[model samples]
Target: GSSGSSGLDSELELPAGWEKIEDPVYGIYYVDHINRKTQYENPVLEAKRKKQLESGPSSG
Candidate 1:
């Protein structure tokens, strides 16, 4: 789990169901555990992360 730098202000108030978490690859992001989903872009700060896996379905 990585962390944000002190110089950069990435801290913000999150929703009750939203939990703060950092990933080794995704960096700082939010987790919607209640909904069983993960939010890469912060609700307050919009960002991007491209997980491009260019693999076609064998049968499709």
Candidate 2:
């Protein structure tokens, strides 16, 4: 997980069932793990993390 800084305010435009939510903190795109709740849930970062794999995918 990332630390030190958080992203801007925005929703990832999640409809349902796909995005991880209500885990409370799990959904936040935080600049840092400081706040309890946040619009810090920047779907943009999630989207970025979506296409962006820190590592490659599996063969499945």
Candidate 3:
């Protein structure tokens, strides 16, 4: 999310019964959306959105 060094690079290990999907853009959509609506909303995600808007798109 951050698009920075500290940003999440890929999917995290899911619990048993969870499976991976093919949509790269939406890879984390399920978890991310849930987190967004819950108290566990990812602070890094919020920071990343801000950073992207403030600094513009990044190649990395």
Candidate 4:
């Protein structure tokens, strides 16, 4: 097949007051400034992952 952009998923599309950041060791993670919390679950990324999962076939 062909290739795509080959970069990150277009700035992540995070929610308001939220930020997507990466760690030197831990890699991709999220930050919530309003709630003052650091969590991993990102809805945008999750939805993208789900869409890609449904669209692509591995063992076909």
Whose TM-score is greatest here?
4
lDDT of 4: 0.62
How many residue pairs in model 1 have overlapping backbones?
0
Q: Per-residue lDDT of 1-60 in model 1, one digit per residue for the tens?
A: 434464242436665577777655666667776887775556545322232535656684
lDDT of each: 0.57, 0.48, 0.41, 0.62
- lDDT by residue for model 2 (4-42), tens: 354444445543333333334454433323334344455
Candidate 2 lDDT score relative to the true structure: 0.48
Candidate 3 lDDT over 1-60, as tens digits, reads 432333353334443333334344443332434433322234455556576785565798
Model 4, runs deviating above 4 Å? 1-11, 45-60
Candidate 3 whole-model C-alpha lDDT, 0 to 1: 0.41
- Collision count for each candidate, in order: 0, 5, 0, 0
Residue 53, candidate 2: alpha-carbon lDDT: 75
The ten-residue window of minimal lDDT in model 2 covers: 14-23
Candidate 4, clashing residue pairs? none
Error of 4 at 27 (Å): 1.5
**Superposed model 2: Cα runs more than 4 Å off:** 1-7, 10-39
Query: Could you tell me every candidate's TM-score relative to the true structure?
Result: 0.45, 0.28, 0.24, 0.46
- The TM-score obtained by model 3 is 0.24
Candidate 2 lDDT score at position 15: 37
